[PDB]
Amino acid sequence: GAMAGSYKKIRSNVYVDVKPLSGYEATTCNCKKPDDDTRKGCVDDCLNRMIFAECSPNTCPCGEQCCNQRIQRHEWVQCLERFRAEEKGWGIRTKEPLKAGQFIIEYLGEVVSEQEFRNRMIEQYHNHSDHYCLNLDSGMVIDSYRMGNEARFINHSCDPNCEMQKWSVNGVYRIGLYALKDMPAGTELTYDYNFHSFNVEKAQLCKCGFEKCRGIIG
Numbered sequence: 001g002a003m004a005g006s007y008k009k010i011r012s013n014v015y016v017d018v019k020p021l022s023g024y025e026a027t028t029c030n031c032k033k034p035d036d037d038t039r040k041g042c043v044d045d046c047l048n049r050m051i052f053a054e055c056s057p058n059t060c061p062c063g064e065q066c067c068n069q070r071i072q073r074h075e076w077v078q079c080l081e082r083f084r085a086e087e088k089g090w091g092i093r094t095k096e097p098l099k100a101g102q103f104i105i106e107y108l109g110e111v112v113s114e115q116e117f118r119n120r121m122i123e124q125y126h127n128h129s130d131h132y133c134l135n136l137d138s139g140m141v142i143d144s145y146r147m148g149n150e151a152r153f154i155n156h157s158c159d160p161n162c163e164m165q166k167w168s169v170n171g172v173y174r175i176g177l178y179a180l181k182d183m184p185a186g187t188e189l190t191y192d193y194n195f196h197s198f199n200v201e202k203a204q205l206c207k208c209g210f211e212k213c214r215g216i217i218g
């Protein structure tokens, strides 16, 4: 019955220490442009998509027809609701059905180096009953304890319907939430923290309720 955790809402990532630069030359896929405004360009066949790179809109042969610029264009689903999830504080659920592979929302926050987060863990996060952090890349981490978006309220499940994917978006790695399977309306979005989130030494009881639930968060 406790109120939701305060944070400052952001529209894009905040780079505190480092930049999550990827070593990429995005963008010379061998995609063919289709003809109808409603036959999308670059499908999974796309060579940028294959290596989780988004096309650039300046160089993509499909132009304004390419459907592989979801993160940079912020093509988030507009049907999320934060809600009281039993035994798991607050969570996020979709209000409309989603489909496997569908991009849902970007995970936002303060991008910090591994060590900066560790310091933060001792000076400020030692009395916390909730943990808001994803691994990004090479010792870098997206911290949403303070600044973030509604993706910070997404809970863990040992049998998840969603996953975090790391994409290079015009040279920078960003993390988005994507559907793993079809999900109907009202469904609580979940991903596996073990794989995606940063480990804390402090264990919490898992309540995901899967038959092979690990019993532990982390």
Ligand SMILES: C[S@@+](CC[C@H](N)C(=O)[O-])C[C@H]1O[C@@H](n2cnc3c(N)ncnc32)[C@H](O)[C@@H]1O
Binding pocket: 005, 087, 088, 089, 090, 091, 129, 130, 131, 132, 133, 152, 153, 154, 155, 156, 157, 204, 205, 206, 207, 208, 217
């Ligand atoms: C990223 S926050 C998610 C939002 C959080 N439920 C809240 O009320 O702000 C992660 C925290 O939520 C709780 N949590 C997430 N998944 C859980 C689960 N499967 N079982 C029990 N608690 C969970 C834990 O307290 C964890 O530290």
Ligand SMILES: [Zn+2]
Binding pocket: 029, 031, 041, 042, 046, 055, 056, 060, 061, 062, 066, 067, 068
């Ligand atoms: Zn493209």
Ligand SMILES: [Zn+2]
Binding pocket: 157, 158, 159, 206, 207, 208, 209, 210, 212, 213, 214, 215, 216
């Ligand atoms: Zn579990």
